[PDB]
């Protein structure tokens, strides 16, 4: 199971870790992907998770989009976790760099409540352009299930922990 996490609340845990390496080690029931509406896993967490699956995540995702169309910003879908997890929950947080509404971040985190335990990144952080301190606050105030957050950057991890109220 999950090791080396700092407990932030009753249900939220955090660790400075590469989510791909963390997923390969823990093999969780659910790994969350920082997805976009088209499930085009080009970069950030999505590009890294997809590269770890040898592009199998992208092939599965393209079939899903061909059948269902794009996801909504704030929405999600459950697909295979491939070699990373039993399932991957692809969650679309708002991308501030694409002019998407930051208010949709709470709706994005609500998807996590459908799963008892998840390994996840901070939604809308990184290349999605939102403030990760804000993302962690929305996570803590929205997710009620057990969430294990992997924060890749040590400097950001220390800022998140030291500023956590």
Site of interaction with ligand GOV (CB under 6 A):
27, 29, 81, 83-86
30 vs 160, which CB is nearer to ligand GOV?
A: 30
Shortest reach from residue 57's CB to ligand GOV, in Å = 12
Phi, psi of 142, deg, nearest 5: -120, -45
Tokens for 125, please give them: 């952080």
Specify the residue, 59 or 101, whose C-beta has the smaller distance to ligand GOV. 59
CB of 28 to ligand GOV, least distance (A): 6
- Between 72 and 86, CB nearer to ligand GOV: 86
Closer to ligand GOV by Cβ: residue 26 or 130: 26
Closest CA to 6 of 141, 144, 136, 130: 136
Q: Are 60 and 80 in contact (CB under 8 A)?
A: yes
Instruction: Report helix, strand or coil for 44.
Output: helix
Question: Counting Cβ atoms within 10 Å, is residue 96 exposed (0-12), middle (13-18) or buried (19+)?
Answer: middle
Please state the closest distance from residue 33 (CB atom) to ligand GOV, in A. Answer: 14
Shortest Å, Cβ 22 to ligand GOV: 12
SS3 assignment, position 62: helix
Place of tokens 């996570």: 139
């Amino acid at each position: 199971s999950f090791s080396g996490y700092l407990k932030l609340t009753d249900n939220v845990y955090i660790k400075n870790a590469d989510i791909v390496e963390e997923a390969k080690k823990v093999k969780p029931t659910v790994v969350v992907n920082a997805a976009n509406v088209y499930l085009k896993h080009g970069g950030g967490v999505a590009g890294a998770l997809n590269k770890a699956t040898n592009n199998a995540m992208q092939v599965e995702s393209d079939d899903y989009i061909a059948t269902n169309g794009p996801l909504k910003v704030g929405g999600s879908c459950v697909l295979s976790g491939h070699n990373l997890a039993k399932h991957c929950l692809h969650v679309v947080g708002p991308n501030v760099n694409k002019g998407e509404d930051i208010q949709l971040l709470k709706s994005a985190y609500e998807n996590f409540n459908q799963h008892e335990v998840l390994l996840a990144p901070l939604l809308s952080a990184g290349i999605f352009g939102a403030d990760p301190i804000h993302s962690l606050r929305v996570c803590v105030d929205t997710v009620r299930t057990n969430v294990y957050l992997a924060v890749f950057d040590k400097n950001l991890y220390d800022k998140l922990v030291s500023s956590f109220l």
